[PDB]
Ligand SMILES: OC[C@H]1O[C@@](CO)(O[C@H]2O[C@H](CO)[C@@H](O)[C@H](O)[C@H]2O)[C@@H](O)[C@@H]1O
């Protein structure tokens with residue numbers, strides 16, 4: 001991951 | 007879906023929001039039929055209906071205005087290609103009521119005259135507008151098909167996979183030995199039909215029976231299975247004729263230096279090297295910015311005609327900042343210095359495909375873009391740069407390191423409104 005859940 | 011989505015609406019309604027027309031995206035649903043739409047057409051909207059005018063088309067979104075409204079007060083945006091919108095005449099043919107919205111009832115006791123007056127010699131939606139939309143809305147693939155797909159763990163090889171999910175022409179590909187895989191569009195250059203790897207001479211990872219099947223298709227005859235994704239389902243920028251019938255278009259030889267979009271980092275264009283020339287124009291490329299390590303393993307396959315490979319100097323001339331070779335320095339790096347160091351030769355301009363399609367994209371245009379680093383995400387994005395055929399797309403409200411160099415005809419970019427049409431979660435700027 002780098003982008004967290006949004 | 008279950009978790010919600012971003013809505014373009016707050017942005018839609020400002021006169022600085024420029025969207026790429028649907029026309030720009032050859033893979034987008036309704037792409038062809040779309041340029042038949044016009045910024046003046048009348049339309050039946052809303053168990054009761056009324057006629058409205060399209061004042062504005064931004065991507066898939068249309069600004070509607072009801073008849074007999076003095077002001078823009080009640081103007082509303084719709085997803086033209088999936089709202090409850092019909093062509094003028096729809097109500098009359100079905101026996102549906104045309105009733106004036108509450109705000110304007112008082113204007114007349116009877117409304118046939120007013121409307122007839124407004125509808126005479128007026129344009130509506132193209133001939134079979136929604137049928138055309140629904141046709142393109144379908145995938146060439148179906149659930150359960152096996153294909154050969156670039157191994158995300160070993161990009162120098164393809165791995166037997168299965169179409170497990172489909173949302174709007176984007177496929178999920180699950181590898182055979184695994185519950186891992188990735189999303190990619192139907193049209194993307196990194197998925198291939200069964201038999202592709204052994205045809206082309208690309209590396210393959212697959213079950214024994216399948217390895218035997220492919221080998222026993224090349225010593226003798228191809229045995230096709232009911233779940234094979236075959237050539238006809240795939241988009242190719244060429245045909246095999248060109249290689250076996252007419253004199254081969256093949257021109258890259260092993261050792262030639264060039265520049266290429268880093269398949270592992272789309273914000274980077276680097277010097278690369280042709281490492282193995284395969285059949286039918288495919289070749290293994292090594293991105294020279296990597297640590298000297300990729301020995302077979304991190305080589306990547308680009309077809310000679312790919313719009314992601316460029317002559318040496320391409321970044322230089324086009325004022326793109328190049329990612330230098332490993333051990334080199336951006337302030338210092340020079341192709342002429344690099345070539346004299348490596349004693350290598352650079353592929354000539356003539357070897358590259360140089361057609362600039364009339365794509366229509368321009369700087370500042372809003373669009374939706376798959377995040378290739380995480381392709382389950384489709385995100386709010388802007389055209390940051392248009393370099394002839396090539397686009398730098400930036401994800402609104404992210405840093406520049408998330409930027410992607412994509413071709414103008416990439417199947418990873420979509421008109422604003424795509425997500426809601428196709429029913430896919432849309433990521434907005436992060437907060
Ligand atoms: O550029 C591919 C793009 O073209 C479309 C437009 O209608 O369809 C054509 O291309 C497909 C890929 O080769 C073909 O299979 C299809 O028969 C042809 O009409 C889109 O479907 C596609 O995204």
Ligand SMILES: OC[C@H]1O[C@@](CO)(O[C@H]2O[C@H](CO)[C@@H](O)[C@H](O)[C@H]2O)[C@@H](O)[C@@H]1O
Nearest residue numbers: 158159161188189190269378379380381
């Ligand atoms: O799920 C994407 C995932 O795959 C990686 C493997 O390192 O890259 C592969 O898949 C991407 C999109 O599916 C492409 O960007 C790339 O060309 C392919 O090698 C990861 O970087 C990414 O997280």
